Amino acid sequence: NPCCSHPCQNRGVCMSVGFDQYKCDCTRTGFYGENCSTPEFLTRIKLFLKPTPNTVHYILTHFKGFWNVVNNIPFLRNAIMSYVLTSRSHLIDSPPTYNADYGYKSWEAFSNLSYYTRALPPVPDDCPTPLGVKGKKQLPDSNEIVEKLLLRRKFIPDPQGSNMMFAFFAQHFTHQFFKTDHKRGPAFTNGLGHGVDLNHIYGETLARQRKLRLFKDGKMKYQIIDGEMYPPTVKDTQAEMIYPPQVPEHLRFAVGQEVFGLVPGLMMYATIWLREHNRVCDVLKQEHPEWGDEQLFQTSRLILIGETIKIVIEDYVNHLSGYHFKLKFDPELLFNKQFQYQNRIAAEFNTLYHWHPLLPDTFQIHDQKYNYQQFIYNNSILLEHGITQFVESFTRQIAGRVAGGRNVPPAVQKVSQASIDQSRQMKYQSFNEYRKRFMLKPYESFEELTGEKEMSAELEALYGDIDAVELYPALLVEKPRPDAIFGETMVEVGAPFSLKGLMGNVICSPAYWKPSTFGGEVGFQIINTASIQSLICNNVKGCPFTSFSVP
Amino acid sequence: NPCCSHPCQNRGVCMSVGFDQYKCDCTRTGFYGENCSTPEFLTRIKLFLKPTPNTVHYILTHFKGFWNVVNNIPFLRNAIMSYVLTSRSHLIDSPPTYNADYGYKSWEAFSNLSYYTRALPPVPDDCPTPLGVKGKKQLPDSNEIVEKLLLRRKFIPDPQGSNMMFAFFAQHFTHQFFKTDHKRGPAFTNGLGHGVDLNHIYGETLARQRKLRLFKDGKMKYQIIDGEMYPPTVKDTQAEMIYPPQVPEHLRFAVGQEVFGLVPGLMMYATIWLREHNRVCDVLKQEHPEWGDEQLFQTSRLILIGETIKIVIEDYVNHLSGYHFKLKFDPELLFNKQFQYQNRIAAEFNTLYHWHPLLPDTFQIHDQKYNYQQFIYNNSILLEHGITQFVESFTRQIAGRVAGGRNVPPAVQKVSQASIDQSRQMKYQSFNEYRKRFMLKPYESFEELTGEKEMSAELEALYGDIDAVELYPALLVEKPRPDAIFGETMVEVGAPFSLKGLMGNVICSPAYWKPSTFGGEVGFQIINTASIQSLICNNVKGCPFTSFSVP
Numbered sequence A, B: 001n002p003c004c005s006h007p008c009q010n011r012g013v014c015m016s017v018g019f020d021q022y023k024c025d026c027t028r029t030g031f032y033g034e035n036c037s038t039p040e041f042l043t044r045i046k047l048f049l050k051p052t053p054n055t056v057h058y059i060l061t062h063f064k065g066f067w068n069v070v071n072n073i074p075f076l077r078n079a080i081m082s083y084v085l086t087s088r089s090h091l092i093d094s095p096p097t098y099n100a101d102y103g104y105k106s107w108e109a110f111s112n113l114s115y116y117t118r119a120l121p122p123v124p125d126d127c128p129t130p131l132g133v134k135g136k137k138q139l140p141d142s143n144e145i146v147e148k149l150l151l152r153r154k155f156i157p158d159p160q161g162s163n164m165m166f167a168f169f170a171q172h173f174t175h176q177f178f179k180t181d182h183k184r185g186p187a188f189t190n191g192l193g194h195g196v197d198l199n200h201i202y203g204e205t206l207a208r209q210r211k212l213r214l215f216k217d218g219k220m221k222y223q224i225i226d227g228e229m230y231p232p233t234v235k236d237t238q239a240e241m242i243y244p245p246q247v248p249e250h251l252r253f254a255v256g257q258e259v260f261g262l263v264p265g266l267m268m269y270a271t272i273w274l275r276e277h278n279r280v281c282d283v284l285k286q287e288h289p290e291w292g293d294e295q296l297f298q299t300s301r302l303i304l305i306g307e308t309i310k311i312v313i314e315d316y317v318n319h320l321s322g323y324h325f326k327l328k329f330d331p332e333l334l335f336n337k338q339f340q341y342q343n344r345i346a347a348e349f350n351t352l353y354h355w356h357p358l359l360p361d362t363f364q365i366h367d368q369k370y371n372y373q374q375f376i377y378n379n380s381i382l383l384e385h386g387i388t389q390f391v392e393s394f395t396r397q398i399a400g401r402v403a404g405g406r407n408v409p410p411a412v413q414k415v416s417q418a419s420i421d422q423s424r425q426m427k428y429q430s431f432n433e434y435r436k437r438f439m440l441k442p443y444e445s446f447e448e449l450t451g452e453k454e455m456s457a458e459l460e461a462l463y464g465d466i467d468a469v470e471l472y473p474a475l476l477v478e479k480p481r482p483d484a485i486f487g488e489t490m491v492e493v494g495a496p497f498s499l500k501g502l503m504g505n506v507i508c509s510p511a512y513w514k515p516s517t518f519g520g521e522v523g524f525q526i527i528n529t530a531s532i533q534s535l536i537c538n539n540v541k542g543c544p545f546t547s548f549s550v551p
């Protein structure tokens, strides 16, 4: 298969012609030639005028006094934010194309919603090396890579100050569209909404939704424990959950996502978001005393979806970015632009989002340290301390640095190995190939990748060629941007996936984005003034301070 | 419910505020005021410069010599065709909004692909009259409407000269996205692909597809009978079909759509499209002797999807329009525009497509006549005359006129009645309510609606108020345009659905629409040269002349 060497550059589509020849389709790539590497004239100019992503990142993270002005000049802030959205989202094909089973466009790959889609097609099955033509005939031992490049010896804190409120928000949030179906394999998902539908609160299916609902006032079922509201149980709802056998029945809280019984941190946000839904229900009932349970529930869900995107853009990502420019959630920025209001979750999006280095060695709640064995599946901890205590504690506890390597906790070691194994199982192309896919210069050496000599020597001993290095391992050991949590590649591959998935939501389309969709101005206002702090303020006893960084 | 009166105009969203108050959301309607009825300044200009549709239709169906010049100026033909697509598609909300159970925006309505969507929301439940406020407490008798207004008394031929080739094409073509799930109700569909995915050839599910495929050279199973290719049997494939018990085993042909055994006219196109598929497999095997079965199959399917859309626009719809202007299938026309590559079939789209007056009183094949008694479920006729004779006979047989009322054959009388009942059951708004939804002046008198005296008289007896007339009845009794097949409403409501459905397909998106997607330039050329004539010519013995109009 001549396409094994990935001959086609700049998004050129490779296709075999006979047994010994290929043909690059350069249509609308900006280039021409056998391999789509000769630039057209406007491409030459653009490339010449295009500053490096790291130059852009410098400018965005410096000159604070300059961005102060920009931030308070609506026309400017809007124009910039609008550009940020369109430029980044352009790197994601929409509607989607390839998946794990198709390196060529096909109706099965487009239409079958059970697959994660793919940004780059899989490596053909009959290739000399598992990645194409580079590297040894066999790939390095996954456990070896994990042990020599990923495993944590000494905890490395996030220089950006990310706390456990951020870490668990990331886990909780992404697991509504990262829902791998291992019954079928790593290439499949149970998140058929492929985005922010809040199925992790309300359930994936109507059947599960109906189990969780109270069908009174539009609300969700709940328990009252020590004066405060918590989710209902498996027993009361009949909504199944993943709990080991030791968990007593009355401690098996039922929420949208089956897996959120895993850690108390997830069950916290489950509790907080459950509280938020029922709160919005009270609000809406006042606005619409003539409304029944159904419209109250449905409108509340739409409001909470908006809240989610609002918070994720203006608190979650703003924190990650480290920008002085204030990011903005505003569907109006795109109403004059070409933009697809749909999304399909990429398998690589899932892979790069395995930020398990965030995890600490122990969890500190109030005056007590819990190890992993103590902390996993322990809902008594949640009741023992209550949500307020949790917020206050997690806000103070630092999270780990993702990029830079050697910062994955031993407890979640095998998970990190699984992340590698499943990449290979789904035939991922190389790190350098994904770099090129998102308009990044490929790394020419290991030393250039890590910015150091120790891990780069291990990499060289493992892989041989820099073009054989795999996506997930490279992402975690990539040289961090100055005092950053991520390296360049995590950002330039991540931001497009994130922003597309957020703005490519139905509620952001002009037909939906108007006050009547959310039951008037009052409801519409809940979205547009939402924040991580006010979410905690309105739903956590005492209204404690919180943010995604430690004070 | 105060919104029963449908107070909000010009796409304004009506919303209850309290028990006896309402509020219109005039967001981006171009209007303001309590009822969104006062035009904004730019709207004033647009409103006064827009020519009536009948003016536009006159201009498009006259000045023949001028259009033949326009047609041969790529710059002009493109510009025109582009505006046609964008303008007509701006009338369809995308992503979709309402369905039969939700007259307000909700996540259940958007996300649930089992519903038909709705261009207008369902009339609320507790309203004064079924339509809202207008009309009597009870709608007139269904059968009585059918008999006094819709039932044929003497066959009325289509002025534009449409034939059975056209009639069965419409039935065959539209039955891939009109698959009402009557096991659940008229509001639900089985075509979850919601558009032109050719499931009526390949089967809706992978399970069914696998039964129909040969898994050799990407081809579909088939028989050779009398030296010609026919679809395989239920026996040979295990693919269930709707056949009555009388039908012998060997005449139980199995194709994608379970119901196409219903008439020989449908099985005709099934056979032709089946031959086209395996023909393209042959063409692609010569271009790619290295390709395997799976890719040969998938790529052929993508090609046939291209062929269908090509023919529907440039042959099928071009015929229907009677436009001197030569419509063009060219996805590149929209790469500059705001356009959403996605679709959701509207129940109203389904309703208005019940062109059952197209049907003759008898079916003439060669030198024989068959009535509905002996024509239905009789594939023996198909094998008796062969496909070639079928095309020769259908090409020459005139179809009935759809507008003007009183042209439904007694055989499908019940069906016509089923249309009205299922409409009421789904809480459709009035005919005049839909005219306003598609920017038409509502008819003020029954006479203006029918342009005659006897039927309008009959209508005023049944309904009383012109605002009480239902969608389906009016569409078929409406005054046709000059020597036209339809009235203006059918067109100005039909076209937006048609074009959105066609151009919203994935393959029209810029990532798919390139030669590599279709196997190269040869494969790509098959799409861009397709016509109803060449489909017949390539897959039917003797290459008989054919067309959607009688000689």
Ligand code: COH
Pocket (backbone or CB within 6 Å): A167, A168, A170, A171, A174, A178, A179, A180, A181, A263, A350, A353, A354, A355, A356, A358, A359, A412, A415, A418, A419
């Ligand atoms: C982004 C934040 C984030 C955090 C904070 C987080 C924190 C935690 C944590 C303790 C707090 C524990 C015990 C786990 C344990 C796991 N993680 Co996460 N993980 C997170 C993102 C991921 C993602 C992404 C996946 C892939 C999920 C999937 O469905 O494939 C993952 C998968 C898992 C799996 C499934 C293993 C597999 O083979 O797929 C386990 C077990 N987990 N993780």
Ligand code: COH
Pocket (backbone or CB within 6 Å): B167, B168, B170, B171, B174, B178, B179, B180, B181, B182, B263, B350, B353, B354, B355, B356, B358, B359, B412, B415, B418
């Ligand atoms: C546009 C062309 C067209 C033609 C030529 C056509 C010609 C014929 C014909 C003889 C030639 C017969 C016996 C039928 C008989 C039927 N038609 Co059509 N119909 C057509 C468009 C429709 C559409 C559209 C529907 C709605 C189908 C759905 O799935 O909801 C329809 C539904 C039906 C149903 C559904 C049954 C029910 O809802 O109770 C029957 C029976 N049929 N029709």
Ligand SMILES: *[C@@H]1O[C@H](CO)[C@@H](O[C@@H]2O[C@H](CO)[C@@H](O[C@H]3O[C@H](CO)[C@@H](O)[C@H](O)[C@@H]3O)[C@H](O)[C@H]2NC(C)=O)[C@H](O)[C@H]1NC(C)=O
Pocket (backbone or CB within 6 Å): A112, A113, A114, A115, A184, A185, B205, B206, B207
């Ligand atoms: C999306 O693609 C999925 C994977 O290709 C597909 O799942 C596959 O479905 C087939 C047929 O339904 C299964 O085949 C099995 O089915 C019966 C079981 O009784 C047997 O007769 C077969 O021989 C075979 O055992 C596959 O097992 C299944 N594969 C996986 C990984 O789940 C989905 O159906 C596709 N989605 C849609 C909507 O079509």
Ligand SMILES: *[C@@H]1O[C@H](CO)[C@@H](O[C@@H]2O[C@H](CO)[C@@H](O[C@H]3O[C@H](CO)[C@@H](O)[C@H](O)[C@@H]3O)[C@H](O)[C@H]2NC(C)=O)[C@H](O)[C@H]1NC(C)=O
Pocket (backbone or CB within 6 Å): A205, A206, A207, A208, B112, B113, B114, B115, B184
């Ligand atoms: C899309 O909307 C459909 C209409 O609401 C919905 O179909 C409905 O699905 C539920 C299952 O959640 C069915 O429930 C029936 O069966 C259970 C079995 O225990 C009973 O408890 C229920 O009382 C009820 O009898 C509904 O009957 C069914 N309705 C129809 C008209 O088919 C789909 O499930 C929705 N799709 C998705 C993906 O959620």
Ligand SMILES: CS(=O)(=O)c1ccc(C2=C(c3ccccc3)C(=O)OC2)cc1
Pocket (backbone or CB within 6 Å): A057, A317, A320, A321, A322, A481, A484, A485, A486, A487, A490, A491, A492, A494, A495, A496, A498, A499
């Ligand atoms: C580590 S950094 O260089 O400070 C940095 C961090 C985040 C971003 C940004 C992301 C992003 C979000 C999720 C994953 C990856 C990136 C985004 O959508 O906008 C900016 C940009 C830069």
Ligand SMILES: CS(=O)(=O)c1ccc(C2=C(c3ccccc3)C(=O)OC2)cc1
Pocket (backbone or CB within 6 Å): B057, B317, B320, B321, B322, B481, B484, B485, B486, B487, B490, B491, B492, B493, B494, B495, B496, B498, B499
């Ligand atoms: C009856 S007529 O006035 O000659 C006429 C016929 C067809 C059209 C046209 C339709 C159409 C197709 C199916 C249903 C309804 C409209 C279209 O998509 O473009 C033109 C426009 C006008």
Ligand SMILES: *[C@@H]1O[C@H](CO)[C@@H](O)[C@H](O)[C@H]1NC(C)=O
Pocket (backbone or CB within 6 Å): A373, A374, A375, A378, A380, A381, A384
């Ligand atoms: C769960 O937490 C409680 C404290 O609230 C503790 O007593 C118990 O030991 C924990 N469970 C395990 C298995 O350590």
Ligand SMILES: *[C@@H]1O[C@H](CO)[C@@H](O)[C@H](O)[C@H]1NC(C)=O
Pocket (backbone or CB within 6 Å): B373, B374, B375, B378, B380, B381, B384
């Ligand atoms: C079916 O057609 C054949 C001729 O092709 C005819 O002899 C037969 O009677 C028809 N069936 C019915 C039920 O009329």
Ligand SMILES: [N+]
Pocket (backbone or CB within 6 Å): A482, A483, A484
């Ligand atoms: N650093």
Ligand SMILES: [N+]
Pocket (backbone or CB within 6 Å): B159, B481, B482, B483, B484
């Ligand atoms: N006429």
